[PDB]
Ligand binder design. Structure first.
Ligand SMILES: [Mg+2]
Ligand SMILES: [Mg+2]
Ligand SMILES: [Mg+2]
Ligand SMILES: [Mg+2]
Ligand SMILES: [Mg+2]
Ligand SMILES: [Mg+2]
Ligand SMILES: [Mg+2]
Ligand SMILES: [Mg+2]
Ligand SMILES: [Mg+2]
Ligand SMILES: [Mg+2]
Ligand SMILES: [Mg+2]
Ligand SMILES: [Mg+2]
Ligand SMILES: [Mg+2]
Ligand SMILES: [Mg+2]
Ligand SMILES: [Mg+2]
Ligand SMILES: [Mg+2]
Ligand SMILES: [Mg+2]
Ligand SMILES: [Mg+2]
Ligand SMILES: [Mg+2]
Ligand SMILES: [Mg+2]
Ligand SMILES: [Mg+2]
Ligand SMILES: [Mg+2]
Ligand SMILES: [Mg+2]
Ligand SMILES: [Mg+2]
Ligand SMILES: [Mg+2]
Ligand SMILES: [Mg+2]
Ligand SMILES: [Mg+2]
Ligand SMILES: [Mg+2]
Ligand SMILES: [Mg+2]
Ligand SMILES: [Mg+2]
Ligand SMILES: [Mg+2]
Ligand SMILES: [Mg+2]
Ligand SMILES: [Mg+2]
Ligand SMILES: [Mg+2]
Ligand SMILES: [Mg+2]
Ligand SMILES: [Mg+2]
Lengths: 153, 394
RNA sequence: UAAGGCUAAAUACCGGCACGAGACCGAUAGUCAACAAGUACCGUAAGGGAAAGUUGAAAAGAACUUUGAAGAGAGAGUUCA
RNA sequence: UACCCACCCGACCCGUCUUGAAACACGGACCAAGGAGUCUAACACGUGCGCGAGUCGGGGGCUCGCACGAAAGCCGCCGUG
RNA sequence: GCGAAAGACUAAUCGAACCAUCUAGUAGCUGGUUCCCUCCGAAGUUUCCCUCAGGAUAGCUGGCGCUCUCGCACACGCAGU
RNA sequence: GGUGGAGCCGCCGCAGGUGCAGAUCUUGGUGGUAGUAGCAAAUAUUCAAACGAGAACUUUGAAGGCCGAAGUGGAGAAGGG
RNA sequence: AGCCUCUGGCAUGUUGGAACAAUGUAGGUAAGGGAAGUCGGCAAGCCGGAUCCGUAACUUCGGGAUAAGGAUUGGCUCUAA
RNA sequence: CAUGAAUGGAUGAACGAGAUUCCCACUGUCCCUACCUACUAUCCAGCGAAACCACAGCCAAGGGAACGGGCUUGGCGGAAU
RNA sequence: GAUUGUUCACCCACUAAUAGGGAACGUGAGCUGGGUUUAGACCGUCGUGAGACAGGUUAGUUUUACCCUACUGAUGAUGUG
RNA sequence: CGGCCGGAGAGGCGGCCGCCCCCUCGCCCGUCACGCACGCCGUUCGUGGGGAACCUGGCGCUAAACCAUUCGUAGACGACC
């Protein structure tokens, strides 16, 4: 399908999208803009340290209640977390795209993640049970992640 | 309506941006007014709180119940090795304040003094003051630091001396020396200055700054205690047992019409680790570290003339939590601010001290040195084998 | 001319069978119901009672290659789209 | 004129009941679709049109299976009223 | 109905159950009441009312007109004087 | 201009279920709150292996533990299907 | 009864990891004073089993009564019955 | 003010999760608080609600529907938490 | 401190003095709930009665903060290459 | 172009001495010339402005900060030693 911001050179640009994935869109958006504009191999390492709690993801827009941390200083923030699922899910998608560029015939080690975007998805439904017999909706918030790697070197 | 039964307020407002202090070494906020007739001296020093102990002395305040009786006084001991002078700094008086003219560091600097320049050391290349030291031997070894002393001689009024501790003589795990500006309350700049030009790269022991039974001020950082409730912080009342939502609070913050809670209401917050300036502490004894002429003059630490043992002020097992004090010290009456190992600043009195309780010359008769790691019962290790004697581990 | 009786036709029909029509509504409208609707579901029970129409013209409904545990993708293909 | 930005002056949040609402009066998170002076009968006056000391209109009747019609036309019925 | 009695309990309901209907019950009382432009423009007073949060009638308002007048060298009439 | 894929409007007349910001309006949808409150009643888990794409949570072994026979054990009634 | 264990049964009762701040909720302990606390001894703690002694006013002569108030209590080796 | 005889008067052993008062004992109820423990809160991975919301959110005084967040005049105002 | 739900009052005792008041008659998402002021009851008076009584008396659920602000602490912020 | 001064309140400016090369310039007069663009506007400078990016030569240069780790003199996390 189409993406927003279709690439400059459709020759040296691979794509990848995921629809209706079970991550939390307020986390996958924060970890998606932190990796934005990096170079692939620098980002694959960064997304593993997000899992090993060696580098954080700075929470800029969705920062309410999010705690301060020490590794937030690199990005010049105060708040930052280590969203592990969010790292794993745009790690497959950063690994799928690394193969679409292989099959298109490109230079894997000169790919720069140039466009990336996370949209809300149709929410799921559950139900929690609350005092005085009320029943609240206990919903999830999935997302459609999509990204376009370019050859920039 | 009014308060039914009046009562004082809890805790002075004269202290109350009660925050974690922004500095660590006690900063002197005012040095004594320099009378330009008395000779040149330093006004401050830099020691380390070690522990406390008992003193026994005779009292001379005639007319009191305890005249010519023996009392016990608790005394801190501030381990205070000789400080080293590294640089001098000039200040000139302005309408807008008191600005700084010209800092001129010596040719050598130190090793411990370099530590205080970079946060991470072993990662760095230790390049600080490696080209300023180059000035001290060439033609420009007269421009930037001989016309400068003449500049600081013409237009300067107040001259402090930058001096750093020796962190290598202490039992402490630290090695980052502590620098501090110590104003020279001498007379006549260019005499105030052609004295520190001399003492560059030089030692300064405690007996130069301070004399015995002199009223000084202690300037350190309170012991830290973290986040604390209104009951510990501002020492309020506890509410009765029945109170539904907590009983360690202040029931009423404020009144309805000033719709802001007031500046002065008691609140939970950080408690401890504030900067405080204790004034009018007395010196009971200036010490002397166990130096060597044949070996180990440990005697001349706690051997007052009236008991003439050979104790060091170090009790058995050293001063708990800190280590053994091995160089000069100053013995202070009562408690000083700070925990063990804390950097303490020692300033001379801004007050003209002429009271009866002050000026009271002191004679120590016995210095307690039994262990503080529990209930010590007997002073020195050889006295231990005068009691029980031969143990099994022999 | 009472105290006994019978009777087709014009007359009435929001149930039923079978039709025809409309200056009517057009999927929150029109019947509750354009669909597996008096169904799902609630209530012990009497009763209550929904939501929900549209790919394309034809399924021609994506073979194959590839990444992935898989969901999902990248190419390819079908199509006037 | 309408998009963004800048400035000087002006400038309180709408609906409502109310002598008086920016009100420490109430309704109002936001956006879509829905949503409130209708029909019938009976008077009254005004106005338009036909005829005019008359004038109808209904119910009937005479003419169709309506396509348009369940219309239109016609009837000492038209005056029984 | 049942109550060693509290108006307790009678399927989360009790100074009088639940279900459907009569039913769109009644409201002098709250709430709302949907496009523009143009012209005119009020009342909170009168008497009567089981009247005092409402009506009835007076006024005040608008719309519709009409009867004339004569600025068409050639005017009577009225008035918060 | 664009996307969209089958119908639509101008004028003269006629007919309306005809114009919404609001009614604690109805139905549906979506925010801010917020990645927040929270996932705190009954003391307790740990090691190794197996299986597996993937193991704090499965399974086996080992160890520590609790329920302690008015049981967290072994069988039934009503109810469930 | 409570407390520990065999037989049998579980895996901390919808999660885990890192810390030991304030407030909390549950538990504990306090020098000297002891109800000065508060509307009130609210809660908590004093007492607590047994054996041996001992027991008031009052009385419906049954009670009060475990009134009150004191003592003793382990382990071991015996003895007597 | 305004008791009183089966609308029962007067008494009263035993009994009372009934209402008071005093004393002994006891005690963190208090002088005056302190520390210790468990579960939280706290931070993290995972998962994730709700009430509420015109617009919103620094003050003094003034006026004003006679106690403003907004208006007048002053005071002042520095991102994200 | 004694009494009192009390404000208010009165006394004891100490002291230098036991001045008087405001802040929505400061202060219930700060407490307590003794008093008022629901439903249970009890007496007195009144009422034929249901019931009434600033006449007494005993028993009677005291919710929600995670939002903005203020405040307290805590990171930071633009500038200074 | 070199040297010596003087100036510190937030100095930021001057001042005063040697040598090289070059020029002859303020006032009156003669003597001619210079796109005379044909009546027309932001002309004339402090301007080698301030800031942001890029093409020549000479001299110098040669890091720290934060994380990770560690420590507790510090701690809710951050932060701090
Ligand atoms: Mg629940
Ligand atoms: Mg339930
Ligand atoms: Mg007072
Ligand atoms: Mg309570
Ligand atoms: Mg000790
Ligand atoms: Mg007949
Ligand atoms: Mg539909
Ligand atoms: Mg539709
Ligand atoms: Mg329908
Ligand atoms: Mg559709
Ligand atoms: Mg549709
Ligand atoms: Mg198309
Ligand atoms: Mg009014
Ligand atoms: Mg007001
Ligand atoms: Mg109202
Ligand atoms: Mg009204
Ligand atoms: Mg079609
Ligand atoms: Mg219609
Ligand atoms: Mg509409
Ligand atoms: Mg147990
Ligand atoms: Mg079984
Ligand atoms: Mg547990
Ligand atoms: Mg369970
Ligand atoms: Mg005690
Ligand atoms: Mg008392
Ligand atoms: Mg009291
Ligand atoms: Mg009790
Ligand atoms: Mg008794
Ligand atoms: Mg929290
Ligand atoms: Mg009040
Ligand atoms: Mg309040
Ligand atoms: Mg309350
Ligand atoms: Mg009460
Ligand atoms: Mg009552
Ligand atoms: Mg009586
Ligand atoms: Mg009577």
């Amino acid at each position: 399908v189409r993406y927003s911001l279709d690439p400059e050179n459709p020759t040296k640009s691979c794509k990848s999208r995921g629809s209706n994935l079970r991550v939390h869109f307020k986390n996958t958006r924060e970890t998606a803009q932190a990796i934005k504009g990096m170079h692939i191999r620098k980002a694959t390492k960064y997304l593993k340290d997000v899992t090993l709690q060696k580098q954080c993801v700075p929470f800029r827009r969705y920062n309410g209640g999010v705690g301060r941390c020490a590794q937030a200083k690199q990005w010049g923030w105060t708040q930052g977390r280590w969203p592990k699922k969010s790292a794993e899910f745009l790690l497959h998608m950063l690994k799928n795209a690394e193969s679409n560029a292989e099959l298109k015939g490109l230079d894997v080690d000169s790919l720069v993640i140039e466009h990336i975007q996370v949209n809300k998805a149709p929410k799921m439904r559950r139900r929690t049970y609350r005092a005085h017999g009320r029943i609240n909706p206990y919903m999830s918030s999935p997302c459609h992640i999509e990204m376009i790697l370019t050859e920039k070197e | 309506s009014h308060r039914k039964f009046s009562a004082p307020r809890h805790g002075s407002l004269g202290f109350l941006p009660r925050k974690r202090s922004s500095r660590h070494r006690g900063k002197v906020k005012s040095f004594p007014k320099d009378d330009s007739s008395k000779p040149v001296h330093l006004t401050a020093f830099l020691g380390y709180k070690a522990g406390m102990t008992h003193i026994v002395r005779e009292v001379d305040r005639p007319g009191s119940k305890v005249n010519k009786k023996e009392v016990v006084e608790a005394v801190t001991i501030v381990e205070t090795p000789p400080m080293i002078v590294v640089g001098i700094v000039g200040y000139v008086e302005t309408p807008r304040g008191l600005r700084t003219f010209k800092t001129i560091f010596a040719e050598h600097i130190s090793d411990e003094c370099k530590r205080r320049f970079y946060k991470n050391w072993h990662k760095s290349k230790k390049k600080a003051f490696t080209k300023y030291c180059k000035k001290w031997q060439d033609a420009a070894g007269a421009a930037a630091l001989a016309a400068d002393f003449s500049s600081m001689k013409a237009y300067c009024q107040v001259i402090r001396v930058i001096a750093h501790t020796q962190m290598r003589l202490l039992p402490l795990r630290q090695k980052k020396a502590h620098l501090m500006e110590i104003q020279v309350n001498g007379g006549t700049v260019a005499e105030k200055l052609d004295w520190a030009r001399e003492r560059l790269e030089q030692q300064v022991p405690v007996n130069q700054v301070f004399g015995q039974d002199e009223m000084i001020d202690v300037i350190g950082v309170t012991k830290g205690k973290g986040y604390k409730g209104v009951t510990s912080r501002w020492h309020t009342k506890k509410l009765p047992r029945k109170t539904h939502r907590g009983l360690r609070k202040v029931a009423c913050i404020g009144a309805w019409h000033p719709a802001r809670v007031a500046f002065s209401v008691a609140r939970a917050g950080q408690k401890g680790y504030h900067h405080r300036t204790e004034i009018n502490k007395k010196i009971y004894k200036i010490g002397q570290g166990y130096l060597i002429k044949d070996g180990k003059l440990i005697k001349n630490n706690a051997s007052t003339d009236y008991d003439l043992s050979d104790k060091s002020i170090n009790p058995l097992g050293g001063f708990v939590h800190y280590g053994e004090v091995t160089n000069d010290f100053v013995m202070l009456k009562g408690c000083v601010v700070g925990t063990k190992k804390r950097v303490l600043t020692l300033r001379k009195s801004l007050l003209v001290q002429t009271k009866r309780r002050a000026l009271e010359k002191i004679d120590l008769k016995f210095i307690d040195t039994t262990s503080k790691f529990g209930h010590g019962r007997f002073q020195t290790v050889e006295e231990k084998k005068a009691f029980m004697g031969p143990l099994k581990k022999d």
